Every structure is written in C-alpha cells, then in structure tokens.
Design a binder for this molecule. Structure first.
Ligand SMILES: O=c1ccn([C@@H]2O[C@H](COP(=O)(O)O)[C@@H](O)[C@H]2O)c(=O)[nH]1
Ligand SMILES: O=c1ccn([C@@H]2O[C@H](COP(=O)(O)O)[C@@H](O)[C@H]2O)c(=O)[nH]1
Ligand SMILES: O=P(O)(O)OC[C@H]1O[C@H](O)[C@H](O)[C@@H](O)[C@@H]1O
Ligand SMILES: [Ba+2]
Ligand SMILES: [Ba+2]
Lengths: 636, 121, 242
C-alpha cells in the first residue's frame, strides 16, 4: 500500500529554532547530509520559540500552491487542518547550511487543552503532572500537537511511508500516542542521555553499580519521577530505540529498562581544505598567537623556550567533577613532579577554559600584553635604523675605508638612543620581587570558593620558574574579540597540542570530537560517549598512534585512572617534532569517520530498521526476503 | 550656546594615590587596536582585488579602468570581522566615557574629582 | 578545441650567446612594481576611511556599521594616480608579449626561436599555451626573475625533458627530489632507470611520465607526449598536490 523507497521523514526535538543544549548542534550539522537525500521529503518539528525564532527562521508563505509540489500536497492539507482548529505555527526554512524546512508549533495556541490532556496521560499511560513544572507541561502540549499532526498526515498521504524521529524525553511525549492511537507511521526514539544518569552522578559510584539500583525509587528520590515516566514510555513505545554512544546504550538498558537496537553517534559537519596539510599550517599560525599571549602572561618571568613548549587544554561547561577538571589538575601536578625528577628540558602550559562568574580581565593581564606590545613596536623601530645602516654599509663598500663587506661590530648598528628606549622597554616588563605569573586571567566573583582555584592551590601549581607545568585558567569561553588572547575557540584548539578531557559523565562530548576533526590529539575516557565509541573502532595501542588516548575510568581505582592519565601526558611530552607532526596527520585521517558523510549512514540503518518492523511484508517483498530483525547492524 | 562644532579635550596630569589603570581604559586601548589591525587585514585583500582589476583591464570584460562597485572589493568574511570589531567597541547602555583613567585610593574625597563632579562635566 | 579554460606558461632555460635582458622585460617588471606600490598607498587611504567610519558609528548620522558606497573610500587623486599606472602598463597597438627575455646575438639563426616561429606560438590572447625562452641559467640576482634555478624548479608544476641522448640527466632527477612531476624519455638514462623500478602505468601516479622514443616513430612519440601533457592539464588542484 505504502512505498518505502520514496518515503517521508519527520524529525522532532525541543532544540530546533532555539539553542537549549547539545541537541541543537547535532540536528543543525545533520541537515546538510539529510536534506541532500530527502530534499523536501524531510521536515523538522519543534516548539515555536516566540523570542528568538524571528532571527533563526526564514519565515515562508505555506498557503501558496507553489509552496509545495504534487506528491507533497498531503502536508498542505494537514497544515490547514491545524489552522482549521486555531493552531498557530511558523513554517519556512532554517537559516543554516542545507536549508532544512521547519514546522514550529506555537504552544500558546493550544494551552487551554492542558487540563484535558494532563489527565488524559494519567489515564492513558499513568504519568503524574505537577503543573508547577513549567517544562513537563510544555512537553505534553508538544507531544499531543505533534500526534494530532502526524495522525492527520498518515491519513491524508497514502503513497509515501512515513517515518518519525524523536530526540530526548521532552519531544518523546508523542511516542506512546503513536502506539495506543496506533497511527500508521514508523517511530524512532533517540535519547542523548538518561534522566537518572545525570542526577545520580551529581552526588556520588555510578558505572559499577547501576545494575543494582531501583529505577522507581531513585526517580521519586530526586523528585524527577513525573519526568522519568515520559522517558521510560518513550523508550518502549518506539519501533527503534537508540542512544548516541555505547557507554550510554549500556546505561539506558538498566535505567530505561530496554536494550537499544543500535548506536546513533554524534557526527560533525567537517570543514575540509583543498590542501590536506593546510590544518598543519593552520596550527603553526594559531600557535603563534598563543605564544603572543604566553609571553604577555609570563612577562619578566620568562625562563623557558617556546619552540619547546606544549600547550594542553581542557574546555567546556564548568562541571568540575563530570568534566574531570579534578583529574586534569591532579594529573598535571603529578606530571610536574615527574618532569622535574626526570630532569626534562620541556615545558607545558596548560589552559583551562570553563565559564565562571567573573568581573572580566585583571589589570595585570592587560598591562602584561600592553607592555609586550610596546616592546615589539620599539624593537621594530630599532631594526629599521639598523636596516638603514646595514644597507648603507652594503652599498658603499669597498669605498670610504670599509674593509669588510658587512658590518662586523654591533656598535656600528646600535646607537645610544636605540639602547636607551629598548632598556626602558625591558624595565616595564620586569615584575615586583617574587611575584609569580598568575593562575588566572580574570577577576572572579567568588575566588575563594571557586572549585578550580581551590584545586590548583591545594596542589601548589603557581607557575614558579622551576615548575615544568604552568597553569592558566581562563574562566570564560574564547572569542576573537578578546583583549589578551584574541582567538575563536576553534582557532585556539588548532593552535594547541593536546586536548585533555578526562570526563566521568559525558554521554557524548563534541569537545574531543571537534578536537580530532581539527587534527589535535586528545586524552579521553572509556566512560565518555566519544571515548567508548573510539576504543570500539580501534585497538587501544593502535589508537595512541592516531592521537586518541583513552583513560580507563570504569575498571580502575580513581587513583589509577589518574596515574594512567599522567602516563599519557608523559608519553606525549617526550615526543619529537617529527613525531608530533606525524601523529597529527594521523589523527586528521580519523576525521572522516566522525563526519556526517558517514555517521549519517547510521541514521539510514536506523530508519530502514523502522521500515522493517512497521510493514514487515512490503519490505520482505521489495528486498526478496526478510533479514534479521533485532539489530540495526543485522539489517544492512 | 554659540553652537560651535569645536571640541576641547582637557587633561589633568597631577599625581595622586592610585591603584594603577582601570580595566576600562586598558580594554579601551586594546579593542581599538583589534579594529586597527583587522582594518589592515582587510585593506590588504582589497589591495589584491584592486591590483588584479588594474592589471588585466581591458581584458576579461572590464569596461572601467578601476572597480566601481564596493562589492567587488569587500567580501562578507571581511564585513563580518569588521562588524565584530565594532561590537567589541560598544559601551553599555548609558555609560558615558570616564573622567579618570585610574582606580583612585580615596576616590570619594579627591579634591579634583569632587570638583569635576560638582560642575557636572 | 576542447574549449579548456586553463593556460600554460612554458619556460625554456638554456644558455645562448646574448647581450643581457631586453629593455622591454626590465621596463615591464618595473611598471608592474610601480602599480603595486601605488595600490599600497591607495589601500592605506582606504584603511583610514574604513577605520574612521568603523569608530564613529552610529554617531554623526552614520546608519550602517560599514561604508556601503565605494565613493566614501576611493577618491579623486586616488583614481588619478591609479589610472596613470594602468596607462603605462598597456602596450603598443597589436604588440605582443615577447618570446625572449634577452637580446640574442644571432636571433636569426637560433634553433629554438626559429622553431617557435615555425610553430607560430607568438603568445596571443587566443593561445592556450604561452612560450617564454630564458637564454641564461637562472640565478637569484637576475633582475627580472630573482630565483636560483632550484627555487624556480620548486615553483613549476611539471618538468618536460623529452630527451633523445641523455646518459643520465640530473635535471629530471633533481626535479623528482624537489617533488615536481616530470615527463622524461625511455632513452634518457634516468628515464630508463625509473621505467624499470616501477610498472609504467603506476609511475604516472608518481609523476614519472616516460615517453617511448625508441620503439615508436618520431611522430608517435610527439603524440604520446601531448597525451601526457594534456592528461596533466586535466588534473585538479587536489590531484596535482597528492
Ligand atoms: O571557549 C569555548 C569552549 C567550548 N566551546 C564549545 O562549547 C561546547 C562545550 O562543550 P561540551 O560541554 O558540550 O562538551 C563545545 O561544543 C565547544 O565547541 C566554545 O564555543 N568556546
Ligand atoms: O638555470 C639552471 C638550469 C640548470 N642548472 C643545472 O645544470 C645542469 C644542466 O643539465 P644537463 O645539461 O646536465 O641536463 C643540471 O644538473 C641543473 O641542475 C643550473 O645550475 N641552473
Ligand atoms: O607545534 P609543533 O608540534 O612543534 O609543530 C610544529 C610544526 O607545526 C606545523 O606542522 C608547521 O606546518 C610546521 O612548520 C612546524 O614545524
Ligand atoms: Ba531519495
Ligand atoms: Ba570492534
């Protein structure tokens, strides 16, 4: 009856025309790869962000007969079917690459139906709903409006087979309504995290005993029961159920009580270069700017040589425990001992870029970079005087009693005036007796109580000249408009040497993923989304040569995790430039595997295993037979 | 009153107990530099583009000796930068530029400040 | 014929008796210099004006963050001097871009030149293949082209040395070391040695193009060489690099 070849696709989450989390950027970068396949058979669904949609959405007239084609008429009728009920919604395009087509339902024009629906869920599924929760109410309203939409289309359109993709427990309200109402579409659910997973990791041992936790007791313990219910339902109600990574897939089986059919890993819209090795040149250039900053920050305390310094960073949302700053700062203090002991000749500036409450840069920072500028200028002025003088000697020889072709004695080129201003310059740099280059670039609102600053102190890293590991904490996201380190985040990362994200709860994390894509080596964990996915695609001792270091945080004592992380850092430091370059080329090669142009075939295998279970015969008819049912990887 | 278009900027260079420069003043000078610098990156692209047009005319169908549409010289990657520069320069709502370049030690008792403050300059 | 948008400058570096560079190639380069210098002044003037607009915005009734009309940036004396530079660049009516850089001693009986004229490649807007014969060994002090031979080599895209007698030939070999792809003949010693060491169709992916100058007619060779040359001219940047 319905064609599985020419089929429609309907993707639904909260984060559509509005950035509310990590979900936003997944869909955004994916549009290019999906629209290239469906063209106009692809439609996204989300709540209308009254405030910020006016910027994001290319508002279009949906009333036109030109606004669609012939086979895409069922939408035209079903949209007016919602306008024939008083339901306001914004249609058009998203102002992003690939230009996907959007349906953004205004939840204000459906608010009165809440008390009817809120009870309807309590009777249909059994989900309690305290209405102080501004958020669960906004989810139910969406779930129903979407079900009221997709039902009216499956009825109108009878040619195409219809597929509905749902992201997160917030947009998965409509999924049990696709089961009980028994609409003739196929549904996929993707959960990017578990509601329990988050809250359990907020206080505590997660990964060793979530086999033995009462799913019903913990949700009521945190007061997150009414939420957890919509997640639990959504996981089962759907044809295909998926997480984003292996380590998450595992935890959703015990906390959402169902095995996932497969993995839908978080791909990226990889920017590529005509020259493969441009990324290498790019590093070069960006590193020069980090240098520029580092000179400013260690001004008059400059003992090490940059041409033999390794930047290291950690970065992302301020979640001290979850992101594993604690292990990063611990490990760094350790590595510092090692390097001193081992009498190494190398240094390691280690940045930490996590937004904290601050009152902007410090007078120190500024003055620092202000003075290094003045030096630079004066130097430049001096060298043109020299230039004048070299040149003149050059052009005069051998006449006027110049015995040598070039100048031999500096005093020929440097004059008193030149020496004076230079010396004045250097004095400006020089800092008060026994003052040390700071561990922070900003005035903090609560410096005493800051977690990161506590830890750095407790381990006594103060950028004393004898420390091989220095620490800078830039408590604020990067941005080329910066006075002191004027770089965009990505430009920073290119310029670095080793990202170091020893996460403890990270369903995915694009931070090390972006990192690899830019061609920078990263340390990560077997409990990280990306980290687990990566130890899967490569053998572990192989993966080190591809710049992917995985710290075991799952079958090891926290102290041993720490020690293993020190090891990787130590292994890396010891590398030569040849070796560092090679391994950077190596890690770039891996780039393609994290591309949507490849992680996107997984959204294909998930879609066809939804077109396998919904109409089991018409697919067995089209291929010739039925293939294995219980897996995404078993189908293709 | 005379509706003059002239302006007087008036310095007072006199030492007083201070805490060095304000983060303001200092940011100030840095943001104006990021502009200065960017405007130089740009002019340089433009330079290429003028040069190329100027080199090949009359060929490839260039009817004017020099470019005529600003658009031929200024790409949006240019615009986008310069636009960011200009945003970095924008003062908060209603914040006028400061009468002083330093954190004073005894600001509320300073003879000079209290005097500027009194005559509302 | 194929209607290709590519061009090919093609260089000949061989010593021949001469009286140094032509006043045309020297004057030419000098006039292109003067233009760059002038473009620098004019972009500096632009910068001031761009910058001023940028700083003053929104004040004094500026409505856009940026200048929008090129008349704000470019002016009278700017256009005046810039045109003067374009003027002194333009060459006499129907005069065409030479095929020598130097004043030859015996240009009349010169084999290379005589061959070019015979083939009539006189560098005309319609010619997709240009010819520049530099009758002097390349040295980075030479005033029109300041490169040492090897530096130049690095700069070129392909080296065509279709020899008949060449017991070794450092030229294609040097070229290969600087990572420049070459066309060489199986009668050249180098070419011979390379023909052996790799299978022949493979060696094309390694930039080693061996023409058969032995078991083929002196007009089957010339065609094979153009089959190579034209294959190369088809390659993209991505492909040229790899
Ligand atoms: O200075 C920064 C640091 C991080 N990020 C971005 O913010 C996100 C924070 O990381 P996560 O918490 O999502 O892992 C990442 O996607 C990263 O690209 C920035 O834009 N600027
Ligand atoms: O401008 C040039 C051109 C070629 N050579 C060198 O002179 C030799 C002449 O080539 P052949 O006659 O030995 O083939 C080559 O080895 C080449 O390296 C130069 O020094 N300068
Ligand atoms: O920062 P490092 O690992 O020392 O890398 C240093 C290297 O960076 C890039 O690869 C540049 O293209 C090289 O010119 C430079 O030698
Ligand atoms: Ba298709
Ligand atoms: Ba495996």
């Amino acid at each position: 009856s319905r064609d599985l070849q020419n089929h429609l696709l309907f993707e639904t989450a909260t984060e559509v025309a509005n950035r509310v989390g990590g979900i936003y950027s997944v869909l955004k970068s994916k549009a290019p790869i999906t629209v290239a396949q469906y063209k106009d058979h692809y439609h996204l669904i989300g709540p209308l962000n009254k405030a910020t949609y006016q910027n994001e959405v290319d508002i279009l007239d949906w009333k036109k007969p030109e606004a669609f084609s012939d086979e895409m008429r069922p939408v035209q009728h079903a949209l007016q079917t919602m306008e024939s009920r008083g339901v306001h919604f914004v249609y058009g395009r998203w102002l992003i690459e690939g230009a996907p087509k959007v349906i953004l339902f205004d939840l204000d024009s459906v608010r009165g139906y809440s008390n009817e629906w809120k009870g309807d869920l309590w009777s249909l599924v059994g989900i309690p709903s305290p209405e102080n929760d501004f958020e669960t109410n906004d989810a139910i309203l969406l779930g129903y409006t979407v079900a009221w939409f997709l039902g009216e289309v499956a009825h109108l359109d009878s040619q195409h087979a219809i597929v509905a993709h749902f992201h997160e427990w917030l947009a998965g309200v409509a999924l049990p309504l696709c089961r009980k109402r028994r609409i003739d579409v196929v549904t996929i659910f993707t959960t990017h995290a578990t509601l329990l997973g988050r809250y359990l990791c907020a206080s505590g041992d997660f990964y060793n005993c979530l086999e033995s936790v009462d799913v019903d007791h913990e949700a009521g313990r945190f007061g997150i029961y009414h939420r957890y219910c919509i997640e639990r339902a959504a996981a089962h109600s759907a044809d295909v159920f998926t997480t984003v990574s292996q380590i998450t897939a595992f935890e959703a089986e015990h906390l959402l009580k169902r095995k996932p059919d497969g993995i839908l890993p978080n791909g990226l819209n990889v920017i590529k270069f005509q020259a493969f090795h441009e990324f290498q040149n790019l590093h070069a250039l960006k590193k020069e700017k980090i240098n520029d900053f580092v000179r400013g920050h260690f001004h008059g305390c400059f003992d090490f040589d940059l041409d033999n310094t390794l930047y290291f960073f950690i970065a992302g949302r301020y979640e001290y425990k979850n992101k594993g700053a604690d292990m990063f700062i611990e490990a760094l203090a350790r590595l510092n001992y090692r390097l001193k002991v081992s009498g190494s000749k190398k240094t390691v500036v280690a940045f930490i870029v996590m937004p904290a409450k601050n009152n902007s840069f410090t007078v120190e920072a500024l003055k620092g970079q202000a003075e290094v500028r003045a030096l630079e200028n004066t130097v430049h002025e001096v060298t043109t005087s020299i230039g004048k003088r070299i040149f003149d000697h050059a052009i005069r020889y051998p006449h006027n009693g110049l015995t040598t072709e070039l100048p031999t004695d500096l005093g020929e080129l440097l004059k008193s005036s030149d020496k004076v201003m230079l010396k004045r310059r250097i004095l400006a740099l020089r800092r008060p007796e026994g003052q040390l280059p700071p561990i922070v670039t900003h005035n903090m609102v609560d410096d005493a109580n800051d977690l990161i600053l506590n830890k750095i102190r407790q381990v006594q890293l103060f950028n004393s000249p004898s420390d091989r590991v220095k620490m800078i904490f830039h408590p604020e996201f990067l941005n080329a408009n910066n006075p002191i380190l004027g770089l965009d985040y990505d430009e920073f990362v290119r310029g670095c040497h080793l990202g170091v994200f020893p996460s403890y709860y990270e369903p995915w994390g694009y931070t090390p993923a972006e990192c690899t894509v830019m061609g920078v080596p990263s340390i990560t964990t077997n409990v990280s989304g990306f980290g687990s996915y990566m130890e899967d695609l490569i053998e572990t001792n192989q993966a080190k040569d591809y710049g992917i270091y995985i710290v075991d945080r799952r079958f090891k004592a926290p102290d041993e995790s720490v020690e293993q992380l020190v090891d990787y850092m130590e292994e890396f430091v010891k590398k030569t430039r040849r070796q560092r370059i090679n391994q950077r080329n190596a890690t770039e090669a891996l780039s393609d595997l994290l591309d949507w142009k490849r992680m996107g075939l997984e959204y294909v295998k998930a879609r066809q295993l939804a077109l396998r279970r919904g109409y089991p015969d018409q697919f067995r008819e089209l291929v010739g037979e039925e293939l294995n049912d219980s897996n995404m990887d078993a189908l293709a």
